[PDB]
Design a protein around this ligand. Structure first.
Ligand SMILES: [Mg+2]
Ligand SMILES: [Mg+2]
Ligand SMILES: [Mg+2]
Ligand SMILES: [Mg+2]
Lengths: 436, 436
């Protein structure tokens, strides 16, 4: 029984204010913190900011916070809802906002309540969060599946200063036998990468991006990939580690063309690429490097481009800004055969229930599901329990550096240990972890 | 009644393993995570690493973990100690190691148990950590004192790739009325700095160091301070923000001289400076910038240089590597009049009890106490409750970027809120916050 709902302003991993919510019950106080992206898709739910340039550079969230305290709270408490009933909770919240993109109260106002409720519910059932989560989603729990982590060891695009267009370059230790081993191999590659990087491009190149990866000032994907393969090799893990990319192409799409030098204000329009051209580029990288997954190869509404590449790709193709964890967007994606994996971001849609549906819809279509954090994270470890609850077999929560990332990775170590013989690591079958 | 003592290996903010301890009582599970330094003094208690180059590059902690699980555990449980008596807990652990520097079990194995015990006690006494702490240390609680945060917005030395020798360039919002206000302005400054940096030094210059600060490739302190001052002004906080430094001189002390270009393998020996020469430089900077604190201006055992400088300092002079949170070392410094402020690090000494004593002896001698994190941090927020419990009035826990840093800051916002009207912000009186 909820006796209280309260919100406050806290800081994210980038030093920007964010919403933190606290829910009180007979069982105790439950907390949750909302994340925040940088390369946020146009179709994402509304993230409300104060816009006051005299405070936090106009990035405060007093309004959103106010909505929780002044509007949401009173009613919620009055409603007397069963926290164990996620759908109920969410329905209430959505009903309260009334808009399609949560423009009334704001997604960051709603999310926090939604997430806090699930925590309170788990306490009530006297079960671990990932367990309640599996319950909510009707996932198979025998056994549970530990996912393969996709570590963004090299940052580009909007996550770091430099010429690199592509946003994330990740390593996936699909060759590990357990979650612990995977993370060990992952950090080993990471340390080698930092050394090489400094060695090949100067000390400064070893400084890090928003997500904790090294951020060398290079201009081609080839140079980034060469470093990674050399690092994997130097670490002694060749063949056990694969690569995944996050192109975040919408960030550089302009006038129906893709600008690979978009970070340069004086970019050369003649160099801009067409969908098909960009597809040729991707293909070149695929043939040369052990890439097993590409995210956002084409812009958020460039449907034809995704569908075209999809038929020749032959590897996991993840939709991020294209789907925005929105069941309706996914249906279209599914119809157009544009991708084969969903990038799940609680904050793109705004409610847990809606996110769980997105996952269920994807899995129903034979798609894969990759749970993810946002570039602006917090000490909150929700997603760790989530990926296990949903049995996706794959997560992306950063490089093995910067605590907003390790918190989730460490959390996964604790769960694996707890589960013992009741869990298996996804390994090479990460694409369809849910079916393991 | 402690039923179980357990430990596991987790990862720090740089991707290196570390010790995580869990203490189980009738009241629940209490956890603690140990931080790890980079520019560690020769006198620090022993941090135990495995040295198996085939795993984690030799930085494993399996041994320390095993020490806790197989050595400390059984004897601790069987001892039936009362967690409420910190002293008895610590005395027990120390006697068990039996070395001057915790070289048998490792300080990293010991600290986790010591700190975890204090959490369990607080639960038992049904009080917030900071209160239990203020209790353990006989601090005056009316009101409580909230500390000024020293934010390390510009990183150098061993914390980042680049030429900059001095380790940390910090801002301190002493001209704020509340901690919440302090952090607010601190971040605003921070955002301004990052922008300016990128403009003045280039995109890559905005990338960050280990502690969340920007890392421009500059060679002089003046370049650094100039960036900062412009940032303060630009953000509109001219007057409310002061500057602090962590020179970490021990790292560049060689042959009785100081090398301001120590990262350069071709450093110019003729350029190396004498103590008095270095002191000159300092006085030069203090004259031109609102610097209010200097940490480790001289080497760990270069006593005479310290004593010399102290005579005409006229500002807070903090001892770090020189004192290593060691009472015996503190005695010496007080006597030789080397500094007037202690840098408190539980991991430099090893037990909560010993660290408390250190603070007490410092306050007794009329010194101030700056509570501190380590460059290799975790999601643990213990020090937030610690600074408050000791009522020091000042803490250093990083820039407002990277959750290993924000987690502590967020936690202080929470406490501020909770204390309400029963607490004051130290402001301009940080030096003697304990006398407020
Ligand atoms: Mg994005
Ligand atoms: Mg993405
Ligand atoms: Mg140091
Ligand atoms: Mg220091």
């Amino acid at each position: 029984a909820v006796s209280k709902v309260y919100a406050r302003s806290v800081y994210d991993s980038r030093g920007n204010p964010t919403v933190e919510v606290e829910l009180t019950t007979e069982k105790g106080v439950f907390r949750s913190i909302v994340p925040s992206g940088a390369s946020t898709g146009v179709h994402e739910a509304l993230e409300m900011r104060d816009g006051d340039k005299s405070k936090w550079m106009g990035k405060g969230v007093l309004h959103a916070v106010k909505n929780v305290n002044d509007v949401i709270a009173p009613a919620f408490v009055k409603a007397n809802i069963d926290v164990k009933d996620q759908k109920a909770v969410d329905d209430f919240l959505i009903s309260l906002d009334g808009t399609a993109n949560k423009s009334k109260l704001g997604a960051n106002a709603i999310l926090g309540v939604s997430l806090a409720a699930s925590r309170a519910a788990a306490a009530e059932k006297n079960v671990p969060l990932y367990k309640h989560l599996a319950d909510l989603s009707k996932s198979k729990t025998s056994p549970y599946v530990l996912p393969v982590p996709f570590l963004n060891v090299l940052n580009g695009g909007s996550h770091a200063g430099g010429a690199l267009a592509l946003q994330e370059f990740m390593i996936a230790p699909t060759g590990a036998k357990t979650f612990a081993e995977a993370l060990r191999i992952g950090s080993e590659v990471y340390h080698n990468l930092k050394s090489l990087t400094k060695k090949r491009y100067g000390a400064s190149a070893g400084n890090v991006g928003d997500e904790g990866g090294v951020a060398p000032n290079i201009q081609t994907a080839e140079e980034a990939l060469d470093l990674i393969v050399d690092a994997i090799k130097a670490a002694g893990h060749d063949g056990k580690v694969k690569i995944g990319l996050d192109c975040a192409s919408s960030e550089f799409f302009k006038d129906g063309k893709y600008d690979l030098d978009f970070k340069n204000p004086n970019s050369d329009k003649s160099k801009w690429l067409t969908g098909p051209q960009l597809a040729d580029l991707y293909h070149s990288l695929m043939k040369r490097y052990p890439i097993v997954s590409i995210e956002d190869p084409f812009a958020e509404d460039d449907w034809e481009a995704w569908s075209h590449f999809f038929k020749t790709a032959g590897i996991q193709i993840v939709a991020d800004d294209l789907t925005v964890t929105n069941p309706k967007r996914i249906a279209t994606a599914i119809e157009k055969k544009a991708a084969d994996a969903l990038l799940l971001k609680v904050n793109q849609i705004g409610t847990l229930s809606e996110s769980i549906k997105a996952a269920q819809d994807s899995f129903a279509a034979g798609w894969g599901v990759m749970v993810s954090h946002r570039s602006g994270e917090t000490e909150d470890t929700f997603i760790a329990d989530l990926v296990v609850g949903l049995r996706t077999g794959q997560i992306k929560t950063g490089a093995p550096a910067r605590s907003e990332r390790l918190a989730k990775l460490n959390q996964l170590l604790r769960i694996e240990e707890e589960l013992g013989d009741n869990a298996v690591f996804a390994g090479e079958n990460f694409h369809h972890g849910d079916k393991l």
